[PDB]
Amino acid sequence: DYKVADITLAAWGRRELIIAESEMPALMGLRRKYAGQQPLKGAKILGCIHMTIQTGVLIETLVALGAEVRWSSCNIFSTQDQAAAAIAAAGIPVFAWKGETEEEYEWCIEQTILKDGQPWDANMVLDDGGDLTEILHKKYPQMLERIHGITEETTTGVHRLLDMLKNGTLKVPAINVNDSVTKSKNDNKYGCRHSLNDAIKRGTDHLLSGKQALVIGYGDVGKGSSQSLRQEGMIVKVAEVDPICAMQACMDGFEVVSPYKNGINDGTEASIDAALLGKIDLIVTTTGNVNVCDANMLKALKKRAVVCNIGHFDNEIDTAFMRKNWAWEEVKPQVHKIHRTGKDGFDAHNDDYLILLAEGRLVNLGNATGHPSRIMDGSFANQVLAQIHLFEQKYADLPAAEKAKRLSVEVLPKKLDEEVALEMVKGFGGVVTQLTPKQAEYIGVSVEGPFKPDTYRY
Amino acid sequence: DYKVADITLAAWGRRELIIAESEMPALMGLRRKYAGQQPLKGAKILGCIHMTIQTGVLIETLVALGAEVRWSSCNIFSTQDQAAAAIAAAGIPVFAWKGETEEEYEWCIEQTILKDGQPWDANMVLDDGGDLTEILHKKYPQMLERIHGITEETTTGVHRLLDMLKNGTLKVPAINVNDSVTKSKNDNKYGCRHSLNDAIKRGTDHLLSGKQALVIGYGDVGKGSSQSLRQEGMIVKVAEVDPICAMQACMDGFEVVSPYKNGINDGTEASIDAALLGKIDLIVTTTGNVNVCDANMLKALKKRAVVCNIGHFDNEIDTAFMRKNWAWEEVKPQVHKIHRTGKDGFDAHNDDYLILLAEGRLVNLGNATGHPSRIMDGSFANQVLAQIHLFEQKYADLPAAEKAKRLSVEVLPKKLDEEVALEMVKGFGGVVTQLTPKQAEYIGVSVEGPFKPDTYRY
Amino acid sequence: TDYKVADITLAAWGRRELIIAESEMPALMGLRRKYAGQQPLKGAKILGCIHMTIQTGVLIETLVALGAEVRWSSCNIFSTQDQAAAAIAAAGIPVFAWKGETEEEYEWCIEQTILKDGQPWDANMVLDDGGDLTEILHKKYPQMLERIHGITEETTTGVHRLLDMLKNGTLKVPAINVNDSVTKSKNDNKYGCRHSLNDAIKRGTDHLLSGKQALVIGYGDVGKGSSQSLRQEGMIVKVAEVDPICAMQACMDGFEVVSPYKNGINDGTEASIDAALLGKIDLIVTTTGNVNVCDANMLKALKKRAVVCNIGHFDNEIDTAFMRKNWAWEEVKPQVHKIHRTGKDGFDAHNDDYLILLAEGRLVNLGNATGHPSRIMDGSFANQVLAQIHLFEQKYADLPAAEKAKRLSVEVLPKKLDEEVALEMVKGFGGVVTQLTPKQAEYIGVSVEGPFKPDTYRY
Amino acid sequence: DYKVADITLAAWGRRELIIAESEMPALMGLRRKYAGQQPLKGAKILGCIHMTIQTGVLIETLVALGAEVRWSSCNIFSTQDQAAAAIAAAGIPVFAWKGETEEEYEWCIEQTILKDGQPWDANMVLDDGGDLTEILHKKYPQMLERIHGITEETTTGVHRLLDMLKNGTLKVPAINVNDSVTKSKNDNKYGCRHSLNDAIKRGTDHLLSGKQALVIGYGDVGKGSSQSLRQEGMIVKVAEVDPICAMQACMDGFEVVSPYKNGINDGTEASIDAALLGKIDLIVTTTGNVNVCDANMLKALKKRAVVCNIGHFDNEIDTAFMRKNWAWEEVKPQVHKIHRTGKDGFDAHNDDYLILLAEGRLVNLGNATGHPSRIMDGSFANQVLAQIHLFEQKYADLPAAEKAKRLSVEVLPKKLDEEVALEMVKGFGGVVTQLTPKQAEYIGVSVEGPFKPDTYRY
Ligand SMILES: NC(=O)c1ccc[n+]([C@@H]2O[C@H](COP(=O)([O-])OP(=O)(O)OC[C@H]3O[C@@H](n4cnc5c(N)ncnc54)[C@H](O)[C@@H]3O)[C@@H](O)[C@H]2O)c1
Ligand SMILES: NC(=O)c1ccc[n+]([C@@H]2O[C@H](COP(=O)([O-])OP(=O)(O)OC[C@H]3O[C@@H](n4cnc5c(N)ncnc54)[C@H](O)[C@@H]3O)[C@@H](O)[C@H]2O)c1
Ligand SMILES: NC(=O)c1ccc[n+]([C@@H]2O[C@H](COP(=O)([O-])OP(=O)(O)OC[C@H]3O[C@@H](n4cnc5c(N)ncnc54)[C@H](O)[C@@H]3O)[C@@H](O)[C@H]2O)c1
Ligand SMILES: NC(=O)c1ccc[n+]([C@@H]2O[C@H](COP(=O)([O-])OP(=O)(O)OC[C@H]3O[C@@H](n4cnc5c(N)ncnc54)[C@H](O)[C@@H]3O)[C@@H](O)[C@H]2O)c1
Ligand SMILES: Nc1ncnc2c1ncn2[C@@H]1O[C@H](CO)[C@@H](O)[C@H]1O
Ligand SMILES: [K+]
């Protein structure tokens, strides 16, 4: 049976899916080339990726390889009704309705994995966040021995596998694709460069040329934010803590500045550089840290400045300071005014206030529609290629003598990653040059790949 | 005492070094921080690196902290007479010479070690070409027994050590620093981005906005090459063989094409894409390979075109095809004219002629100045710090029970590289922020660093 | 008092949009203070037809503050912002504008701007855009032009039509060409589209743009901003032009120039179109203001799934009439439609050969988005409100017949007022202007506080 | 006929005159687009503009259209014999060098107008700066009744021409070329975005990525300079006296600053803002006014900063307060080192000293070759056609009534300015669209042009 808020919405879902799947050369090429080869025949997969219409393309892809699947949603908010009814109409069971209370979802966490009222024989597992990785070890250990392997994509859940490997709890092998080149370049750096100024303009509608912005942190995401601001016409300052990253910011044309005098933070009103915070119009925070934009910074900020976060979650900006002594007023669904004059009794025509986007949380998913389709394609294409390599190995059928040595946490091989990238090149219409036999020997590389060492920094 | 051509030029040399010292913060900062401690007192070092004012500054800051050194040359050709005099008149022996001749290094090497016809007491080596390692191992076996360590800068020479470590021939620990972040990002990427268009606009004195350009290979050198050309105003095409690099090049705003139909390199003129080559005029070869540009692209290229090589040797462009049928003419110190008609019938008004910038060899070192001093500064401070890290161990004074555990090729630890980068960031006027304790345990990194793991790509 | 807008419920939302907006326009809000006790526009009457965005609210508020009487209506089919029009109506201005209109509705709304209780009210001034409002008053209802002091024109496509009437002698009242000021030509036409074009493209269809190819028709003042908007994102752009000088400038900025027809000559057959390049183009944009710059033989040769959009002022740029008679249309969302090629009256749900069209080929950045930002629109609106005062003083209809024929022409404002606007517009960003020593002014040849460039200077 | 020097010339530059003329699309394209018939058979012209390798091509172009102009050299520099001996070898007399009579080269002028003692018959004049134009009124007025018109190429000279028209002394109509739109944008803007940074690097070999700059003025030269510095990664600031140019600077991604507090200059040491000045690493002068470098900023400037000039007038930098009161040194044949120690007596180890790159003059002349060919080629093509247009009116051969009303000074018409833009577009390989008669009617323009009104500001 299916649990979708409404089923009649499938008519719109298919119309939406047909155009969207036209934008994804990688999954289409995977469908085209492995026609007849059917490497997924006889494989039954259990999956938990978030139910967006994007993943419907993948779900239709790998089944076109000859695989039967069962499905659910990992997060209680990451779902779409029109796609959910679409898969329900297709035939694959779904429980991706939006309960938004987390009590109905806790009642159905095991409803998805049970066939009817008992466990059953499943072959491969594809998860998101490791929530299902906990389940088959702790709830129903019996079906563990038949699992060939696990694919998971998250860097906060891979640590769980890493520190259960040492404890000897991990029963069947796992694979990680987050640390690969294509996913790391596409998800982190690009997309943000494409969506940050979309989010700022879709919500505020202000001009950006000729103004001043401060960006804290210069990682992969910090670079994507710095590029998206300059190309619109702003002048950008970077605050960094790692000396090596700060060296790149200077050589790319930025002013490295510290909002504390001499770079020391003493937690006092006099530790701040008041000549800097009183001149800047926009602040963007790009760290996975805590309290990088503290209380003393904002009191020195110029009036009418815009605050937005793209980092981890609601810790970089002291938003808890806001609800204690400053008032909040609403403009639109996710733009607010914070009034510095007092907790209540504020006035519309006031001069000292602040502009906040997405009330602290991530904005490029809040004040816009997020990553496009050409980008969330090679991230997905690598994962389905995890299944093929992991299914052929036949972990469960191995006898106990050699079974022990293949229980490991490894990285996605580089040769596989060169095949997702080849289809994006052909998706853009590009042509890749072939190596003559005499030529490839000089590099000391196979004609088909891989071309680069394991330590190479792309 | 000395083999410099003229001792008298030392005053002019010193005049040059005095100004050159102004543009190297990293070397200067070392002297301020480590005064009074005098870490290098008692050390005796040999050197072999090529000579200039820059390495003269490096030697002066080396001897400032208390070391005694002897010095020589690594490259046969490159010579800097006035700086060599400037040091030979400082009281430090230098044995460089002019003549550009190989037969005298039989005596040039032996004069580096022989103090008075006898082996001299040594503690470190600062070899560059790896030739001192060879003489050290194969000659004077009784003397190398007290050497603490070795620092090398080149990947083509660290291989000769990494292959011999498995064989047990290596007798002293070494450090490879070419894989350090500062060394890799400064040299490969930023120097060429600074000097490519300068070399072009000196050699040709043309204009570059609104023209057709092709860049073959998309490595770090080629990643920094196209940036220098897109700023001037060129429409630039990119060719590549590694799919992931091409997938980057598409996402940087370049069109990816190949000179062969569908990419298959048959060998006959029937396979050359005649339409694409017919409107390009500037070529910059990036790859370190063989015949990446064979005869049929130069036989089919547009009528007027200039050739630029930034690779490593004389194998990227078929320059030996030139010498047998297409004649040459000199117009300026290094710019040549190549007429695609024959070796007879030279004419002065011909339209079908091509242009080489450095007769096929690398053009940056031939037609221009090379890297600026500021970039070259940070390449040397790591070699400074490596000597300290090797001197702090006292490898030769450890018991023979433990000496068997130290013959290794390790990389430079991250902390030293961060300290080198900090002295740069203070040179531009940037200020690096300091972490409070309550933010340090959040990541899992101490307040002093290093902040990134070993596997991180910057 | 009376109004017909999409809704009144959205009155609050527009206001908060405006209070922020008022703080982004230093130059216009300056005149609201300088001429506070001095009220030059007392007893004036205006009827205007401009895009009803969030900026056009502040201009109405300004004119009301200086004592004007306003009856206003929108200018285009898809241009109004239904929260911005609600506030102006809610304040008391009779206004008639909504979204998704038709040519039947387009002409009705203007028809209420002139008529009141059926009676044509005595209008002293007109604020027109695109020449539409001019044409009715001249061809219809001649009684109005014998009591009109002046009219103000803002777009370059209506200026052409207005100088067209002078040569024929059918023009009755003088006008100020507000479009030729520097704070209008080189501030709005160039930078405005740079901020809004690639915004509007991304909100409508939402594709990644880095790494695709596009074609741009026209390298005028709008063309430059358009090309920069595309290039800064990652596109591989080409420009097509009929003017040699603008073509040379396009070559100098790092672009390549091509033409849709072989050798450049447009015979009219299918054998003149070059399908070599049209078969790899994912985007075409019209910036011409002319007719038939994208004809029927071009659309047939186009690569599948390509995108088309227009930023001129009319529908004549692309030959739409072929599409709506030969090919079937399907809607995927507002202002975006799908046209299935080779299908006269039907289409499969899995078809591969089709095209996509943004807002049916009308003004896309204003129909598929919210238009230019507030800060750029400060100079031109200041020029407009300033030009209202200059004509309102001469009292054209009160002059005698001898003095009547000496005031009939078209002109542009003097440079000093432009510089005064530019100063207050600069001061907002945080710049500091440096005054000249009494020796420096004499050396250069200008006054210390006077004009600094002659009128021939092009900037 | 040879009068500049010895022949001295066989292959000392004549070779690269070929690449020079091939570089220039329009000046050579007209040569064959208006060949076949020769409209200029009988135009006897004289005077000078320059004498370079790029200046000898115009004379040959005129001759190919049938003219027989007589030439000589002028202006500040006349050592460029690498092309002068070629012109003399072509059969027309020319004068470049002289007996060091830079104060008075009028003796050369007497050798040009005269043929056999009797003055040479002429009907047209081609002048640079007017020192030769006055001669046909002050010294030899009897020849002028044969003149059809004159051409002038200077911004100061047109002022004197308009003054002469205000007076009555004008006796021949004259045409102006500086108003050509293809000349205004090329020589002003495009010529300094290619040459400023190249010259800076050529004379200093410095790194600019990360340093901070100040540029005074935002005219057309300023617009070129700002792009030429920004594209290299510097942080650029802008200063201006025109509010409109400042407005334009605000929206191009630059910041507006003022060397004087509140912008009010009064000569006091208390009104200047030394804090801003103590951080600027470079100042470039772009105006044409007086005292943009007062003696006070040279006192408050940061140590070891760079000062540059690209303007025309030398009172921009207070050089008189520098060549007095302070000591000077020469680093290299074009760069100088000036000490702020005091009157005299300096040790070469100090921290306060500045640097001048051409000593107050234009840096694109001394430290660089200058405007490349493809920019200043657009300038000359306005000259041959200007001769063509004035030759078909026959000003002298009109009766008295027509001659009185034809004495008028006008710019070159718009129709001729697009016939030069066509030939430069066609050079890079582009194609220009042709309009249909139905389209031509709708706009209001004939299919042959001109296409835009005269008050249009491109
Ligand atoms: N919203 C999105 O679309 C999105 C996408 C990818 C990642 N993320 C999130 O981004 C976060 C980090 O980005 P990343 O993955 O590029 O990480 P990263 O580690 O590569 O970058 C973090 C940088 O911040 C610096 N930093 C740390 N503490 C700082 C401080 N107090 N002040 C200044 N700089 C400081 C670090 O030195 C480092 O350079 C993660 O939490 C990740 O979940 C969000
Ligand atoms: N001039 C300088 O300043 C300087 C500095 C550093 C290195 N180098 C030299 O540059 C050379 C190459 O640069 P790198 O070290 O960054 O290279 P790299 O190792 O980063 O990669 C070389 C690139 O060439 C591509 N490639 C290989 N064969 C190809 C072929 N036949 N056709 C097309 N592409 C092909 C590879 O895919 C790769 O992208 C080296 O040999 C090095 O010695 C020069
Ligand atoms: N949407 C907006 O914000 C906005 C703003 C101002 C003006 N406009 C509109 O822009 C249009 C004109 O733009 P402008 O102000 O830059 O005027 P413009 O005259 O400077 O530009 C028109 C350009 O089109 C070129 N052109 C004409 N026929 C052509 C052809 N067949 N092929 C190629 N190019 C051709 C002309 O040579 C000229 O360069 C008008 O329709 C006007 O209403 C829109
Ligand atoms: N070196 C060359 O190749 C070259 C070429 C052409 C012109 N020039 C010379 O360059 C100079 C300017 O060139 P242009 O015509 O592009 O400039 P411009 O005439 O267009 O503008 C010069 C600017 O100087 C500004 N200015 C004047 N006094 C000022 C002050 N005290 N502070 C700040 N700004 C001030 C003015 O506002 C003006 O914008 C002229 O002297 C001209 O002769 C040199
Ligand atoms: N937001 C806006 N509100 C009103 N008019 C606008 C806006 N954006 C652009 N315009 C003007 O609309 C006209 C379109 O032809 C141009 O004159 C342009 O300046
Ligand atoms: K808007």
Residues with Cβ within 8 Å of C256's Cβ and at least 6 positions away in sequence, in order, are B235, C238, C239, D430
Name which of B370, B426, B420 is nearest B27 in CA terms. B420
C371 is in an annotated binding site: no
CA–centroid distance, A205 to ligand 6, in Å, is 6
Q: Compute, in angstroms, the gap from residue B219 CA to the centroid of ligand 2.
A: 5
Chain A positions in Cβ-Cβ contact with residue B421 (cut-off 8 Å): 243-244, 246-247
The reply to whether A153 belongs to the active site is yes
D298 within 8 A of D318, measured Cβ to Cβ: yes
* B440 phi, psi to nearest 5 deg: -75, -45
Closest CA to C109 of C98, C118, C119, C120: C98
**Is B242 at the interface with chain A, CB within 8 A?**
yes
Instruction: Tell me how crowded residue C186 is: count the other CB atoms within 10 A of its CB.
Output: 20
Please tell me the residue having the least CA distance from ligand 3 atom 27. Answer: C288
Sign of CA dihedral D276, D278, D284, D289: positive
Closest D-chain CA to B351 = D22
B256/A425 Cβ within 8 A = yes
In 3D, which of B81, B78, B75, B56 has the Cα closest to residue B3? Answer: B81
Give catalytic status of residue D314 as yes or no. Answer: no
Q: How far is CA A177 from CA A184, A385, A417, D451, in A?
A: 9, 10, 9, 59
Q: Which of C211, C235, C254 is the closest to B210 by Cβ?
A: C254
- When CB atoms are compared, the residue of A179, A247, A452 closest to B424 is A247
- The Cα–Cα gap between A382 and C63 comes to 61
Q: Report how far residue D235's alpha carbon sits from residue D232's, in angstroms, rounded to the nearest whole number.
A: 9
Out of B210, B230, B253, name the one closest to residue C210 (CB): B253
A181 is in an annotated binding site: no
Distance of CA C256 to the CA centre of its chain: 27
Strand partners, B410: B175
Cα(B414)–Cα(D373) distance, rounded to whole angstroms?
Answer: 51
The secondary element (H helix, E strand) that includes residue D409 is: none
Residues forming beta bridges with residue C119, ordered by sequence position: C116
Proximal ligand: closest to the CA of D238 = 4
Find, among B58, A351, D285, the residue nearest to C22 by Cα: A351
Distance CA C137, CA C129 (A): 14
The rounded distance, in Å, linking the Cα atoms of C122 and C132 is 19
Those of residues 136-175 in D touching chain C at CB distance below 8 A are none
Which of D255, D333, D323 lies closest to D295 in space, CA to CA? D323
Concerning whether D153 is annotated as a catalytic residue, the answer is: yes
D chain contacts of residue A250, beta-carbon cutoff 8 Å: 209-210
The alpha carbon dihedral of D94, D100, D105, D108 has a sign of: negative
Task: Tell me how far apart the terminal alpha carbons of chain B are, to the nearest angstrom.
Answer: 48
Distance D442 CA to ligand 3 centre (A): 13
Q: Which subunits count as partners of chain D given 3+ CB pairs below 8 Å?
A: A, B, C
Q: Is any Cβ of chain A less than 8 angstroms from the Cβ of D251? A: yes
Method of elucidation: cryo-EM
| Cβ atoms of residues D217 and C404 within 8 Å | no
Secondary structure class of B382 (helix, strand, coil): helix
Q: Which of B236, B247, B248, B251 to mutate to test the interface with C (most CBs of C within 10 A)?
A: B251
Under DSSP, the state recorded for A128 is S
Distance from CA of D212 to the nearest CA of A (A): 9
Q: How far is the CA of C157 from the centre of ligand 3 (A)?
A: 8
User: Nearest CA of chain C to the CA of D425: how many Å?
Assistant: 5
CA distance C444 to chain B (A): 34
Any residues with CB less than 8 A from the CB of B159 and at least 6 apart, and which?
A: none
Q: Which amino acid is at B218?
A: Y
- Whole-number Å distance between alpha carbons of A420 and A379: 9
Q: Give ∠ CA A217-A219-A221 in degrees, rounded to 5.
A: 95
- Chain-centre distance of CA B216, in angstroms? 21
How far is the centre of ligand 5, averaged over its atoms, from the C-alpha of C192 (Å)? 9
By the 8 A CB rule, do D254 and D237 touch?
Answer: yes
Residue D93: how many other CB atoms lie within 10 Å: 16
C384 is an active site residue: yes
In sequence order, the 6+-apart residues with CB closer than 8 A to the CB of A426 are A25, A29
Which residues on B lie below 8 Å from D206 (Cβ)? 23, 372
Q: Is D245 on the interface with C (CB under 8 A)?
A: yes
Beta bridge mates, C127:
C48, C152
Cβ separation of B209 and C253 shorter than 8 Å?
Answer: yes
Residue C29: phi and psi, rounded to 5, are -65, -20
Q: Cβ distance B280 to B237 under 8 Å?
A: yes
Q: How far is the C-alpha of B198 from the C-alpha of C66, rounded, in Å? A: 59
Q: What are the two backbone dihedrals, phi and then psi, of residue C128, each rounded to the nearest 5 degrees?
A: -110, 150
Question: Ligand 4 centroid to D234 CA: how many Å?
Answer: 22
Going by C-alpha positions, the residue among C168, C152, C191 that lies closest to residue C389 is C152
Largest CA distance in chain A: 80
CB under 8 A, 24+ apart: contacts of D333-339: D334/D203, D334/D358, D334/D366, D334/D367, D335/D203, D335/D204, D335/D367, D337/B19
Angstrom distances, CA of residue C412 to CA of C418, D426, D455: 11, 37, 11
CB contact under 8 A, C375 and A206: yes
Contact criterion met (CB < 8 Å) for D372 and B331: no
- Measured between beta carbons, the chain D residues lying within 8 angstroms of A236 are none
* Rounded Cα distance, D175 and D411, in Å: 6
Structure-block tokens of residue B98: 């002019």
Give the CA radius of gyration of chain D. Answer: 25
The pair of three-digit structure tokens given for residue A304, joined into one six-digit string: 């009418």
C264: which chain D residues are within 8 Å (Cβ-Cβ)?
431-434
- Is B389:B176 a contact under the CB 8 Å cutoff? no
Dist. CA D421–CA D181, nearest whole Å: 10
Helices (DSSP H) in B332-413: which residue ranges?
A: 364-367, 373-391, 400-403
**Angstrom distance (rounded) from CA D257 to CA D247:** 13
Chain B positions in Cβ-Cβ contact with residue C256 (cut-off 8 Å): 235
Q: In this structure, are residues D226 and D238 in contact, taking their beta carbons and an 8 Å threshold?
A: yes
Marked catalytic residue, from D21, D127, D152, D153 = D153
**SS3 (DSSP) at B71:** strand
User: Taking a C-beta distance cutoff of 8 angstroms, is the pair D312, D288 a contact?
Assistant: yes
| CA-nearest residue, atom 17 of ligand 1 | A219
Concatenate the DSSP letters of all residues of C288-311 into one string.
--SS-SB-HHHHHHSPTT-EEEE-
Specify whether the CB–CB gap between A410 and A173 falls below 8 A: yes
A53-64 and A25-33 are packed helices; what angle lies between their axes, rounded to 10 degrees?
10
Closest C-alpha residue for ligand 1 atom 44: A311
Please tell me the distance in Å from A420's CA to the nearest CA on chain B.
9
Asked whether the beta carbons of residue A256 and residue B432 sit closer than 8 angstroms, the reply is yes
Query: Which of C91, C72, C67 has its CA nearest to residue C11?
Result: C91
- All domains in chain D, ordered by first residue: 1-189+371-430 (3.40.50.1480), 190-370 (3.40.50.720)
Whether the Cβ atoms of residue D48 and residue D127 lie closer than 8 Å to each other: yes
For residues A387 and C371, what is the distance between their CA atoms, to the nearest angstrom?
A: 48
For residue B259, cis peptide bond before it (omega within 30 degrees of 0): no
CB atoms closer than 10 angstroms to residue A55: 23
User: C206 touching A, CB under 8 A?
Assistant: yes
